[PDB]
Write a protein that holds these residues in place. Sequence first.
Motif, PDB file in Angstrom:
ATOM      1  N   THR A 193     -17.212 -19.480 -50.244  1.00 26.12           N
ATOM      2  CA  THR A 193     -19.019 -19.859 -50.177  1.00 26.12           C
ATOM      3  C   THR A 193     -19.564 -18.621 -51.407  1.00 26.12           C
ATOM      4  OG1 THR A 193     -19.450 -19.385 -47.909  1.00 26.12           O
ATOM      5  CG2 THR A 193     -18.919 -21.444 -48.656  1.00 26.12           C
ATOM      6  N   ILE A 194     -20.253 -19.694 -51.842  1.00 24.05           N
ATOM      7  CA  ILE A 194     -21.294 -18.762 -53.052  1.00 24.05           C
ATOM      8  C   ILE A 194     -23.075 -18.614 -52.676  1.00 24.05           C
ATOM      9  CG2 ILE A 194     -22.329 -18.946 -55.548  1.00 24.05           C
ATOM     10  CD1 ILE A 194     -19.196 -20.704 -55.507  1.00 24.05           C
ATOM     11  N   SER A 195     -23.645 -17.613 -52.506  1.00 25.85           N
ATOM     12  CA  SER A 195     -24.448 -17.843 -51.732  1.00 25.85           C
ATOM     13  C   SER A 195     -25.771 -17.827 -52.499  1.00 25.85           C
ATOM     14  CB  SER A 195     -25.402 -16.417 -50.916  1.00 25.85           C
ATOM     15  OG  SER A 195     -23.847 -16.046 -49.655  1.00 25.85           O
ATOM     16  N   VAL A 196     -26.734 -18.332 -52.434  1.00 33.38           N
ATOM     17  CA  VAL A 196     -27.759 -18.581 -53.335  1.00 33.38           C
ATOM     18  C   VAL A 196     -29.024 -18.602 -52.486  1.00 33.38           C
ATOM     19  CG1 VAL A 196     -27.534 -21.346 -52.537  1.00 33.38           C
ATOM     20  CG2 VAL A 196     -28.678 -20.449 -54.273  1.00 33.38           C
ATOM     21  N   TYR A 213     -33.644 -21.179 -63.916  1.00 34.87           N
ATOM     22  CA  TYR A 213     -32.962 -19.799 -63.211  1.00 34.87           C
ATOM     23  C   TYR A 213     -33.201 -19.187 -64.387  1.00 34.87           C
ATOM     24  CZ  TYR A 213     -28.570 -21.861 -65.596  1.00 34.87           C
ATOM     25  OH  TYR A 213     -28.219 -22.407 -66.474  1.00 34.87           O
ATOM     26  N   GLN A 214     -32.437 -17.529 -64.940  1.00 38.99           N
ATOM     27  CA  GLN A 214     -31.947 -16.837 -65.119  1.00 38.99           C
ATOM     28  C   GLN A 214     -30.705 -16.717 -66.096  1.00 38.99           C
ATOM     29  OE1 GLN A 214     -35.862 -16.607 -66.177  1.00 38.99           O
ATOM     30  NE2 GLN A 214     -35.181 -14.922 -66.442  1.00 38.99           N
ATOM     31  N   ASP A 215     -30.702 -16.605 -67.080  1.00 43.07           N
ATOM     32  CA  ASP A 215     -29.390 -17.088 -67.705  1.00 43.07           C
ATOM     33  C   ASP A 215     -28.514 -15.367 -67.907  1.00 43.07           C
ATOM     34  OD1 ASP A 215     -29.655 -16.605 -70.371  1.00 43.07           O
ATOM     35  OD2 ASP A 215     -29.237 -18.318 -71.077  1.00 43.07           O
ATOM     36  N   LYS A 231     -23.560 -31.198 -62.972  1.00 39.39           N
ATOM     37  CA  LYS A 231     -22.054 -30.304 -63.572  1.00 39.39           C
ATOM     38  C   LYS A 231     -22.140 -29.098 -62.438  1.00 39.39           C
ATOM     39  CE  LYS A 231     -23.577 -29.889 -68.481  1.00 39.39           C
ATOM     40  NZ  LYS A 231     -24.299 -31.634 -68.847  1.00 39.39           N
ATOM     41  N   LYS A 232     -21.225 -28.477 -62.270  1.00 38.71           N
ATOM     42  CA  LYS A 232     -20.624 -27.784 -61.116  1.00 38.71           C
ATOM     43  C   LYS A 232     -22.081 -26.549 -61.337  1.00 38.71           C
ATOM     44  CE  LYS A 232     -17.639 -28.800 -61.128  1.00 38.71           C
ATOM     45  NZ  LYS A 232     -16.131 -30.036 -60.801  1.00 38.71           N
ATOM     46  N   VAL A 233     -22.343 -26.276 -60.716  1.00 35.45           N
ATOM     47  CA  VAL A 233     -23.435 -24.666 -60.405  1.00 35.45           C
ATOM     48  C   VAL A 233     -23.078 -23.437 -61.585  1.00 35.45           C
ATOM     49  CG1 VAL A 233     -24.676 -22.894 -58.935  1.00 35.45           C
ATOM     50  CG2 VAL A 233     -25.544 -25.405 -58.867  1.00 35.45           C
ATOM     51  N   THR A 234     -21.575 -23.380 -60.899  1.00 42.36           N
ATOM     52  CA  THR A 234     -20.662 -21.775 -61.122  1.00 42.36           C
ATOM     53  C   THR A 234     -20.691 -21.813 -62.908  1.00 42.36           C
ATOM     54  OG1 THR A 234     -18.729 -23.105 -59.886  1.00 42.36           O
ATOM     55  CG2 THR A 234     -20.583 -21.364 -58.638  1.00 42.36           C
ATOM     56  N   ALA A 235     -20.081 -23.621 -63.761  1.00 45.51           N
ATOM     57  CA  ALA A 235     -19.971 -23.566 -64.460  1.00 45.51           C
ATOM     58  C   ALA A 235     -20.808 -23.464 -64.988  1.00 45.51           C
ATOM     59  CB  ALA A 235     -19.191 -25.300 -64.390  1.00 45.51           C
ATOM     60  N   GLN A 236     -22.109 -23.417 -65.245  1.00 47.22           N
ATOM     61  CA  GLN A 236     -22.710 -22.980 -66.255  1.00 47.22           C
ATOM     62  C   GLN A 236     -23.546 -21.298 -66.055  1.00 47.22           C
ATOM     63  OE1 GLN A 236     -26.480 -26.604 -65.252  1.00 47.22           O
ATOM     64  NE2 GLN A 236     -24.702 -27.093 -63.969  1.00 47.22           N
ATOM     65  N   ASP A 237     -24.348 -21.314 -67.082  1.00 46.80           N
ATOM     66  CA  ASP A 237     -24.510 -20.047 -67.011  1.00 46.80           C
ATOM     67  C   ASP A 237     -25.269 -18.917 -66.402  1.00 46.80           C
ATOM     68  OD1 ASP A 237     -23.736 -17.536 -69.711  1.00 46.80           O
ATOM     69  OD2 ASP A 237     -25.613 -18.329 -70.912  1.00 46.80           O
ATOM     70  N   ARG A 290     -25.919 -16.256 -64.208  1.00 48.83           N
ATOM     71  CA  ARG A 290     -25.743 -14.245 -63.476  1.00 48.83           C
ATOM     72  C   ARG A 290     -24.644 -14.435 -62.834  1.00 48.83           C
ATOM     73  NH1 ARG A 290     -28.558 -11.951 -67.265  1.00 48.83           N
ATOM     74  NH2 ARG A 290     -28.610  -9.920 -65.986  1.00 48.83           N
ATOM     75  N   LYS A 291     -24.023 -12.779 -63.137  1.00 46.98           N
ATOM     76  CA  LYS A 291     -23.316 -12.244 -62.353  1.00 46.98           C
ATOM     77  C   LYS A 291     -24.044 -11.491 -61.002  1.00 46.98           C
ATOM     78  CE  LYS A 291     -19.769 -10.918 -65.586  1.00 46.98           C
ATOM     79  NZ  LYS A 291     -18.528 -10.810 -65.318  1.00 46.98           N
ATOM     80  N   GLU A 292     -24.874 -12.134 -60.051  1.00 44.97           N
ATOM     81  CA  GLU A 292     -25.867 -11.748 -59.258  1.00 44.97           C
ATOM     82  C   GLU A 292     -25.641 -12.412 -57.497  1.00 44.97           C
ATOM     83  OE1 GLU A 292     -29.980 -11.038 -59.682  1.00 44.97           O
ATOM     84  OE2 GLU A 292     -30.152 -12.672 -61.210  1.00 44.97           O
ATOM     85  N   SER A 293     -25.546 -11.752 -56.801  1.00 47.24           N
ATOM     86  CA  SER A 293     -25.277 -12.522 -55.155  1.00 47.24           C
ATOM     87  C   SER A 293     -26.462 -11.956 -54.385  1.00 47.24           C
ATOM     88  CB  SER A 293     -24.320 -12.377 -54.849  1.00 47.24           C
ATOM     89  OG  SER A 293     -23.683 -13.054 -53.555  1.00 47.24           O
TER      90      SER A 293
END
Length: 336
Positions: free
Chosen positions: A2-5, A47-49, A61-67, A69-72
């Motif tokens: 699970t990806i935190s947001v 969001y910031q791409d 669309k799927k969130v992770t499929a969009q552009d 960032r590599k941020e958590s």
Amino acid sequence: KTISVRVTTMDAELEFAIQPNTTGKQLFDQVVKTIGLREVWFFGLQYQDTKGFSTWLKLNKKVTAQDVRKESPLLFKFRAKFYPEDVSEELIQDITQRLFFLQVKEGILNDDIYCPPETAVLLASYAVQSKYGDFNKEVHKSGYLAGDKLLPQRVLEQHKLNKDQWEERIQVWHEEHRGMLREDAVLEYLKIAQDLEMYGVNYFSIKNKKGSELWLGVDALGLNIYEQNDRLTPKIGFPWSEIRNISFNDKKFVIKPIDKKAPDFVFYAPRLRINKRILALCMGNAELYMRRRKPDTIEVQQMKAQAREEKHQKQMERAMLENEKKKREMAEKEKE
């Protein structure tokens, strides 16, 4: 896993854990249920791409499929992408009005939305009534507004006036608002703000056939062609009633007219990325133009009853809290 947001509205931080399959729709739906928003059509998640651009998350669309960032955690800002044609006749909920107020006030204070100095003074007075409530000489002493960012910087750096004189100007209007509910002050802010020429206008830089540089304004009423220097006053205007179709291909945009005994309007924008945003905003502002014409929903009606009764319940819980405050203030008088 699970990806935190994190979602930040104009006044709230939120935490969610999303699966790699979560769509923008499913994320957005947990955001709005959390804050209680039902007037979901005006709002989106920004969001910031991976190139630092502010972008709107697409809900199909799927969130992770969009552009993203590599941020958590992944950061999102819940904002309004669409604006009403009339705040008083379309912003039912307090949460909807509050979120708009904060967002528009931010645009004004920043100079993104132009605001004449005299209008900013009136606007700041409503913002002061929203935050402080009724002006009291006993509580609001000389210097009470020093801590608040109240005017746009173009206003402050154009006029001689210092923090004291500027406060004096606003406090006159704050006094004038004595008796107003904070929620109605919020609504009065929105009613003056929405009459600003730049209010709710998404601008984009374009070029006509000849090559001259222009501005494209996309709004709730239509499309407008402004000059390179004057983005306040459009030169050409196309309401959503006269637009039959909007399309673009390899930089060229063509707006087809409803009256087919009238020519096409050709304009040119340079980035694919922005062009998709122009089209999406066109598509959404035109869908909303029509909805606003076709009569009121048997959901909107139920929400208007909901928000009207909840308003009388607020002015019953606040009535019982004022009686206790007035009794405790009178008791704490004979102390010194």
